[PDB]
Amino acid sequence: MKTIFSGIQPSGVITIGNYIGALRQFVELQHEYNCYFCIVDQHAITVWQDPHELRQNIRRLAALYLAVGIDPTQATLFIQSEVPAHAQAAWMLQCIVYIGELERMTQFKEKSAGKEAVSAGLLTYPPLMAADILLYNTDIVPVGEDQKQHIELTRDLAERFNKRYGELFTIPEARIPKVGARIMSLVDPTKKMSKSDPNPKAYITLLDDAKTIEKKIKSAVTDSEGTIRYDKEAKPGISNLLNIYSTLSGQSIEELERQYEGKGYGVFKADLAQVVIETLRPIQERYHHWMESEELDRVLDEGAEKANRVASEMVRKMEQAMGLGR
Amino acid sequence: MKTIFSGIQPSGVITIGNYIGALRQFVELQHEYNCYFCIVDQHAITVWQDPHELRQNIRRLAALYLAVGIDPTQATLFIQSEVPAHAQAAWMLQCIVYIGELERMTQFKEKSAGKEAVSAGLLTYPPLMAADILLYNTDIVPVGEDQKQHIELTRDLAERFNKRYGELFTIPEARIPKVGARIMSLVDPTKKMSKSDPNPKAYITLLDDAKTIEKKIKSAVTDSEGTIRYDKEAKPGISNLLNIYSTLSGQSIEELERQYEGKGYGVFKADLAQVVIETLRPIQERYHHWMESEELDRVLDEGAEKANRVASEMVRKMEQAMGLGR
Numbered sequence: 306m307k308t309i310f311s312g313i314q315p316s317g318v319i320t321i322g323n324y325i326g327a328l329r330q331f332v333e334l335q336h337e338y339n340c341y342f343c344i345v346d347q348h349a350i351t352v353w354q355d356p357h358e359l360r361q362n363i364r365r366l367a368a369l370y371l372a373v374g375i376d377p378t379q380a381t382l383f384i385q386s387e388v389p390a391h392a393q394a395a396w397m398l399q400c401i402v403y404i405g406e407l408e409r410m411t412q413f414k415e416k417s418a419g420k421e422a423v424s425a426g427l428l429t430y431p432p433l434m435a436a437d438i439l440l441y442n443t444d445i446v447p448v449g450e451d452q453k454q455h456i457e458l459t460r461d462l463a464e465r466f467n468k469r470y471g472e473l474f475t476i477p478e479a480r481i482p483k484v485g486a487r488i489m490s491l492v493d494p495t496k497k498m499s500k501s502d503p504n505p506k507a508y509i510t511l512l513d514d515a516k517t518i519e520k521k522i523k524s525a526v527t528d529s530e531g532t533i534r535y536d537k538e539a540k541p542g543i544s545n546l547l548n549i550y551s552t553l554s555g556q557s558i559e560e561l562e563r564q565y566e567g568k569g570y571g572v573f574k575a576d577l578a579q580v581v582i583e584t585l586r587p588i589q590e591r592y593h594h595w596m597e598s599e600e601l602d603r604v605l606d607e608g609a610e611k612a613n614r615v616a617s618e619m620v621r622k623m624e625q626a627m628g629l630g631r
Numbered sequence: 632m633k634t635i636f637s638g639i640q641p642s643g644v645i646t647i648g649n650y651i652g653a654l655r656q657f658v659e660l661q662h663e664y665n666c667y668f669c670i671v672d673q674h675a676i677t678v679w680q681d682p683h684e685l686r687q688n689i690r691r692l693a694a695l696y697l698a699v700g701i702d703p704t705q706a707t708l709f710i711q712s713e714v715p716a717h718a719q720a721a722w723m724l725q726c727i728v729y730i731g732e733l734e735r736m737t738q739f740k741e742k743s744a745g746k747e748a749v750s751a752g753l754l755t756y757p758p759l760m761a762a763d764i765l766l767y768n769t770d771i772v773p774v775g776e777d778q779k780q781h782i783e784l785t786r787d788l789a790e791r792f793n794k795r796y797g798e799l800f801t802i803p804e805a806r807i808p809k810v811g812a813r814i815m816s817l818v819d820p821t822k823k824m825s826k827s828d829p830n831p832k833a834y835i836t837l838l839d840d841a842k843t844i845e846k847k848i849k850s851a852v853t854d855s856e857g858t859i860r861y862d863k864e865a866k867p868g869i870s871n872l873l874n875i876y877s878t879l880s881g882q883s884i885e886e887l888e889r890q891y892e893g894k895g896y897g898v899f900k901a902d903l904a905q906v907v908i909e910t911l912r913p914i915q916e917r918y919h920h921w922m923e924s925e926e927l928d929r930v931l932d933e934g935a936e937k938a939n940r941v942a943s944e945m946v947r948k949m950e951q952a953m954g955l956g957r
């Protein structure tokens with residue numbers, strides 16, 4: 306069967322945008338593919354991290370993955386740093402990528418914007434992501450739209466390596482949701498919902514309580530049409546709300562538009578907030594159980610064992626192809 | 632006792648400049664320090680390498696290290712790629728180094744000069760070299776003058792890491808020969824003798840036969856003074872020859888100047904060439920023995936075992952300091 310790989314950075318804020326664009330895909334696809342889901346801690350350190358928060362955020366993210374329903378018997382869940390192959394593969398790929406290719410990455414340009422003094426990990430972020438994916442002979446990489454370009458570069462690297470050293474890598478392909486590929490800020494619906502937004506009202510975290518979710522949904526910027534119709538360009542706010550509602554409820558955009566024919570934003574928002582709470586509650590309760598269990602570490606231990614067996618062998622093949630070592 | 636670390640890239644050409652600036656130091660210091668001598672294959676791939684040549688060049692360099700007298704009971708000889716910690720440590724250090732710091736490296740500027748399309752490994756060469764050194768709690772790094780700046784950056788990184796995450800690294804210090812720190816081209820004595828010089832008469836390789844050495848020494852560009860006196864600025868050619876003679880013969884520059892008082896360049900060059908042959912012959916014969924022995928691999932195997940035990944533990948400490956993993 307085919308292989309899937311996907312990663313998420315461990316951080317203080319895991320949003321419903323991460324859930325809808327990614328985690329929901331992981332759970333959907335886990336039984337049909339060989340799955341590798343990673344907590345990308347080495348990618349997290351591309352920007353300064355408080356060490357204590359990082360260690361906690363890594364456990365938090367593992368807990369959320371399992372809380373959302375990632376099943377360790379169906380998928381391999383692990384921490385990037387615990388599989389040395391990623392760093393090994395990243396170095397080899399860094400040697401074949403051009404500086405200009407890295408410089409044109411939008412993620413890099415955005416994260417480095419208006420900085421003095423940019424840390425190099427930010428620039429070399431892609432080769433490490435390419436190594437993440439290529440290590441496992443990945444076919445499909447389920448992500449939100451913001452990762453598309455990185456995966457395009459990964460494809461370029463895989464092809465370059467294969468041309469130079471002999472066919473070794475499978476050329477991976479992004480799988481990006483039709484609806485919910487890019488969940489926007491509740492505060493400014495022309496902007497992507499980001500885990501680093503200085504305004505906490507811009508995102509809903511997976512651990513937000515009911516009152517908080519209600520406040521954030523109610524406050525979500527809309528328009529003065531009082532019409533619940535999807536129109537990304539004309540009604541960015543309501544359209545984004547419709548995407549969240551659709552993806553989380555399972556109802557189609559058309560279904561919701563009819564359901565709310567003649568209705569105002571007030572009833573819509575109240576109903577949406579209930580849909581968000583309904584989604585998050587069971588996740589939160591499963592999350593706290595994981596956070597207090599010794600089983601969390603056992604799952605990660607098993608995930609790292611499997612990941613290492615696979616990635617280490619690919620690293621051997623990579624080295625043999627380039628002539629490194631012996 | 633203190634610790635020494637030093638590396639050399641495996642390449643088609645290992646020169647008497649590598650011998651005089653480095654290898655001679657390794658042998659001199661091996662009994663008094665804990666020594667780690669590395670074949671930097673991951674650094675070699677910062678420029679394209681034919682895979683077959685690379686694999687051979689790595690064995691060739693191991694053979695030369697042992698041929699020159701590196702003793703496996705006194706030092707640890709190993710291949711960089713066979714110790715995953717180097718790549719792991721390099722990533723962590725890449726996350727703390729600034730792009731501008733890498734961009735100002737002279738080695739990078741020179742190797743990337745007049746290129747289109749520069750491969751990223753060339754730019755990230757330093758963090759990997761810093762990881763090489765810092766992994767082993769290195770005190771002293773014996774090299775020729777051309778590596779001084781890289782070691783300065785390594786010191787900057789070690790201090791930065793220690794300030795941010797707690798004191799972990801020893802701040803390493805270069806040890807650069809007083810005489811022979813920078814052996815120059817025999818063809819243009821204002822240029823460093825380089826393994827990549829398009830003119831084979833510019834360098835003497837450790838495997839050059841007697842006739843070849845004589846031809847290269849005889850042809851070495853001098854001046855029209857017929858005076859054998861050291862004067863780097865005024866007589867770059869003769870001064871460089873004097874440095875080679877001094878370092879290889881054990882005689883001081885003063886000693887040689889007196890020995891050749893009233894003599895012409897012809898007798899000087901003939902005598903120098905004999906000194907080079909006298910040096911290289913036993914090295915070459917030991918080199919061919921190593922190249923045909925199964926013991927070469929056994930030495931590297933043992934070197935990688937020891938290096939891994941040490942570097943892997945430092946990597947654990949590094950991760951704990953940054954909060955990576957668990």
Ligand SMILES: Nc1ncnc2c1ncn2[C@@H]1O[C@H](COP(=O)(O)OC(=O)[C@@H](N)Cc2c[nH]c3ccccc23)[C@@H](O)[C@H]1O
Nearest residue numbers: 311312313314322323326327345434448449486487488498
């Ligand atoms: N507003 C949003 N709307 C929809 N989807 C969104 C939204 N915000 C985030 N996502 C998706 O969530 C996943 C994790 O996001 P990260 O920022 O940790 O995503 C990142 O920082 C990656 N560099 C981590 C990574 C490292 N290696 C990998 C290998 C394969 C795939 C991914 C990775 C991603 O799928 C992201 O697209």
Ligand SMILES: Nc1ncnc2c1ncn2[C@@H]1O[C@H](COP(=O)(O)OC(=O)[C@@H](N)Cc2c[nH]c3ccccc23)[C@@H](O)[C@H]1O
Nearest residue numbers: 637638639640648649652653671760774775812813814824
């Ligand atoms: N003309 C010359 N005169 C005097 N000394 C010279 C001359 N040419 C070369 N050297 C010295 O030889 C050693 C190996 O050279 P490399 O180019 O492989 O040297 C290099 O390419 C390093 N980046 C390899 C390295 C990787 N990691 C390390 C950690 C510690 C020390 C060294 C390394 C060096 O000591 C170099 O200074």
Ligand SMILES: [N+]
Nearest residue numbers: 335336338379
């Ligand atoms: N599966």
Ligand SMILES: [N+]
Nearest residue numbers: 661662664705
């Ligand atoms: N020693």
